[PDB]
Design an enzyme around this catalytic site. Sequence first.
Site, PDB file in Angstrom:
ATOM      1  N   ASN A 294     -39.982 -21.714  -4.123  1.00  0.00           N
ATOM      2  CA  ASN A 294     -41.112 -20.829  -3.841  1.00  0.00           C
ATOM      3  C   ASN A 294     -41.185 -19.736  -4.893  1.00  0.00           C
ATOM      4  OD1 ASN A 294     -41.851 -18.500  -1.090  1.00  0.00           O
ATOM      5  ND2 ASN A 294     -43.229 -19.678  -2.441  1.00  0.00           N
TER       6      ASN A 294
ATOM      7  N   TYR B 287     -53.823 -11.202  -4.189  1.00  0.00           N
ATOM      8  CA  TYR B 287     -52.634 -11.012  -3.379  1.00  0.00           C
ATOM      9  C   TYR B 287     -52.073  -9.609  -3.549  1.00  0.00           C
ATOM     10  CZ  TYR B 287     -47.592 -11.615  -2.493  1.00  0.00           C
ATOM     11  OH  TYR B 287     -46.295 -11.451  -2.083  1.00  0.00           O
TER      12      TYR B 287
ATOM     13  N   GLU C 253     -48.606  -7.935   3.849  1.00  0.00           N
ATOM     14  CA  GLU C 253     -48.690  -8.794   2.670  1.00  0.00           C
ATOM     15  C   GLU C 253     -50.015  -9.521   2.912  1.00  0.00           C
ATOM     16  OE1 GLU C 253     -46.049 -12.240   2.546  1.00  0.00           O
ATOM     17  OE2 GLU C 253     -45.879 -12.014   0.370  1.00  0.00           O
TER      18      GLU C 253
ATOM     19  N   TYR D   8     -53.603 -11.870   1.547  1.00  0.00           N
ATOM     20  CA  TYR D   8     -54.115 -12.948   0.677  1.00  0.00           C
ATOM     21  C   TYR D   8     -55.623 -13.119   0.872  1.00  0.00           C
ATOM     22  CZ  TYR D   8     -49.401 -15.132   0.323  1.00  0.00           C
ATOM     23  OH  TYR D   8     -48.080 -15.514   0.187  1.00  0.00           O
TER      24      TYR D   8
ATOM     25  N   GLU E  24     -49.174 -18.970  -6.563  1.00  0.00           N
ATOM     26  CA  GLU E  24     -47.989 -19.173  -5.753  1.00  0.00           C
ATOM     27  C   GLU E  24     -47.732 -20.668  -5.649  1.00  0.00           C
ATOM     28  OE1 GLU E  24     -47.773 -17.100  -2.049  1.00  0.00           O
ATOM     29  OE2 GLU E  24     -46.155 -18.281  -1.292  1.00  0.00           O
TER      30      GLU E  24
END
Length: 190
Positions: free
Chosen positions: A44, A77, A86, A88, A177
Amino acid sequence: QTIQPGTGYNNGYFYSYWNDGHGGVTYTNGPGGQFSVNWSNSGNFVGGKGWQPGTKNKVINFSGSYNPNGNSYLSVYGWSRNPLIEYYIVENFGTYNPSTGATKLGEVTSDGSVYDIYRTQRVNQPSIIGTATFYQYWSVRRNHRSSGSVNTANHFNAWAQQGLTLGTMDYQIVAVEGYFSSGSASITVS
């Protein structure tokens, strides 16, 4: 230049590149707001350019080539603090919709497409302040694209109407990502 994970400023733009320790990722900062990420069997990772701190009304432009081979996202982001969030605004993704399994809260139309809104929770996970539990806010674009403009205010306002509020902004970038996949991307932010 090609660099390992870290944050900083390059050619007038903030950048953040993070990964879970697995190899296979090649992140490279370029001129202006450009960066490229080529990954081969990564873990990741999240990397891209923008601003530190972001704002709640920024109109963000992006363009480039996005070629994911598996699980990957292309998003505006960022984070806020107090509350720790967090978030998006997903403009494109590969084989996996990040909202899978999440409860849909609504829909908002912005910059040429409908987006579906969701909230998820991360428990005891890494964050900009260390191990923490926090919520994630999502706008997922229905019509995928690799270039365009994102009026962040439309999303933040839509989220607010569903009770999803943001704190004091921390960084705000256009990020690629990936999650245990392969792919190639080159993006310019402005």
